[PDB]
Nucleic acid binder design. Sequence first.
RNA 1: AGAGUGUAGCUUAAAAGCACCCAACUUACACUUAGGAGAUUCAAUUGACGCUCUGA
Lengths: 51, 45, 131, 217, 99
Amino acid sequence: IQELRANVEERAARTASVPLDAVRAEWERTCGPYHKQRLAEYYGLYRDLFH
Amino acid sequence: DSSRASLTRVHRQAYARLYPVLLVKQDGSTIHIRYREPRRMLAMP
Amino acid sequence: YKTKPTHGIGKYKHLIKAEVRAINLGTDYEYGVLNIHLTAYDMTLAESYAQYVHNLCNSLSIKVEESYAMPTKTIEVLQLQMLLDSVLTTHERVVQISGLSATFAEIFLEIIQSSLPEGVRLSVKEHTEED
Amino acid sequence: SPWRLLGALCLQRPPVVSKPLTPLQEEMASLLQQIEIERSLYSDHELRALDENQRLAKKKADLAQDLEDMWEQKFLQFKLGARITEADEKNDRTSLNRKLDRNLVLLVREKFGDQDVWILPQAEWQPGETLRGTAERTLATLSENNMEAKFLGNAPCGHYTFKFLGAKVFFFKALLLTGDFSQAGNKGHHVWVTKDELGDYLKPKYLAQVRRFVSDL
Amino acid sequence: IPIEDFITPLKFLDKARERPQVELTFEETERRALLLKKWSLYKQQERKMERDTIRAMLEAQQEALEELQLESPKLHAEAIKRDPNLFPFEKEGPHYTPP
RNA sequence: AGAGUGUAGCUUAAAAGCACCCAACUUACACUUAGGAGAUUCAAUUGACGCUCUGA
């Protein structure tokens, strides 16, 4: 975070795009299982698949 | 902590120019007063 | 309902108070609406000082009923020696304070004396005036 | 439980000259002045200078500088007071007019037969007397000067007890207004001290904590 | 008859065609933003220092009051008693040069 | 020398919520729109570097 803040220097925020592929990869390689379990619970998979 | 409220700004929109004026009263002391026109000295009798 | 155990659950008037002497008991003491007139020649300086005073009062949990400003006095002084005009003006702003208890007033006075701006005097007194 | 009755007072002094502006503060003030000059709406001097010059040029093709020079010469003739009145003296540690930007504090030196403590302007109050009255008497007698000490309230500021027979040093605050000292070259080695010199001189722990409630500024 | 002086005079209506241009550059805006951030940080630090000093003063006064009440149960009321010496409270701020 | 301790101001959270202010709408305060500083003090359930109290 410190390196990113030093490289941006404030001037970039005064409108960056931020890629999405790396963000999706990181989300799938970390908290992906959490969102997957949440979606499964919302869709009603545990209450029907494994009872 | 005297320089805290010293730095100010005109919060209004319509206002004439204001220059730093050193007003000297009978007591003898310069005070940064914002008087009309760029007056450098205004001795108060 | 009344008989039901959920009585008085939607009561909100008892929480809102939708309705000055100087109490001086033995242990508790409270002044009577102290008025702090900020006499100065600059308008921005006086405004900033009043804003800082109000911010300090709000941070210290001090009540601020009124905070009006007094009119300007156009003091026309003729610089004699040669006639040279100099229409000066003296601005004044009042800040009412009531919440004070023992050393709180001393703390506030010390804070004021420590944070004084250039070209601004003081003159604290009671509220009994005629605007 | 014989508690030794002792008092004291932490003298102060209101500043006169303003404090210096930090380079960052100076840049902020310059930016504020620039934005104010940019947001201002016309001016009497500008209206009387620019329009007059334009009219004169138009008439020639068919005030301002004088007043500026007058103001410059008036400012040059008028000599202001010396703001830095500390470096010129340096060794004048016992002078009320030494420091003007920071707060000053009295400092008296007293030596006893049994101890030699760096005694701050202390006092001694009587059971039948009041602490405020004792402090006023000590300020009007020990200092030997006609001062207009403007107090704030009857409450204290800091207490420090010491046992061996208990005791208690009661301190207070007093703001001066016009201190007329008589005979400054007296035997009483009184010294005026602010903050850094206070922390550098005070050797004991009883007074080392007195600076915790003093306006650091 | 409270009549404040906050209404813009009528002279500031017609006279308003002398400085209508307000052009700046990217470097100037960046420098202004940096200066504003630095001043905000400095003001926050100063406010924190002032709050710490106020807390220290309050703690010292509380300790003094406690010591007074412990070693003098007949002077706490006199100490808390506010004296009538604050009605003509008048004091001038610090100037720039001495007399 | 002993006791209390150990996430910035606070937490029956384990790197989040309430605190803060600089600019615009304010006489002023508040709300709202724009940003930041912010911390498990280190070494392997334990040892020491920062404060309060009890003493000399």
